[PDB]
C-alpha cells in the first residue's frame, strides 16, 4: 500500500557558544565611505549578527 | 571400437534479487513539501511500483 515513517518529536539547535556582537556600527553607521575604484574590505568573523 | 564417457557442466541463470524501490525516501526524505510537489508532478510512482 504505502510506506510508514516515524515523525520527529522536537528540534535541537547546536550553534557554537558565541556571545560577542559584530561591529556593524563601523560599516553601516560610518562617517564616510570609499569610492568604487578604492573600495574597502572589512572582514567580520567570530561574533553574532543580530 | 571404444568410448570415453565425459561429464560437462552447463550454467544457466534462473532469477536474481527482487529489488523494491521506495518512492519518497529515495527521491527526497523527511520532506513534506517535496512530497507535495512530487504528488503534483504526476502518478509516476504508482506505475513504477
UniProtKB/Swiss-Prot annotation, chain A:
Function: Attaches the virion to the cell membrane by interacting with host receptor, initiating the infection. The major receptor is host ACE2. When S2/S2' has been cleaved, binding to the receptor triggers direct fusion at the cell membrane. When S2/S2' has not been cleaved, binding to the receptor results in internalization of the virus by endocytosis using host TFRC and GRM2 and leading to fusion of the virion membrane with the host endosomal membrane. Alternatively, may use NRP1/NRP2 and integrin as entry receptors.
Subunit relationships: Binds to host ACE2. RBD also interacts with the N-linked glycan on 'Asn-90' of ACE2. Cleavage of S generates a polybasic C-terminal sequence on S1 that binds to host Neuropilin-1 (NRP1) and Neuropilin-2 (NRP2) receptors. Interacts with host integrin alpha-5/beta-1 (ITGA5:ITGB1) and with ACE2 in complex with integrin alpha-5/beta-1 (ITGA5:ITGB1). May interact via cytoplasmic c-terminus with M protein. May interact (via N-terminus) with host bilirubin and biliverdin, thereby preventing antibody binding to the SARS-CoV-2 spike NTD via an allosteric mechanism.
Descriptive protein name: Spike protein S1
SS bond partners: 22-47
Glycosylated position list: 9, 11, 17, 29
Outcome recorded upon mutating residue 32 to T: In strain: Omicron/BQ.1.1, Omicron/XBB.1.5, Omicron/EG.5.1
Superkingdom per UniProt: Viruses
Region annotation Disordered: where it falls in the sequence: 5-21
Included range, full protein: 315 to 364 of 1273
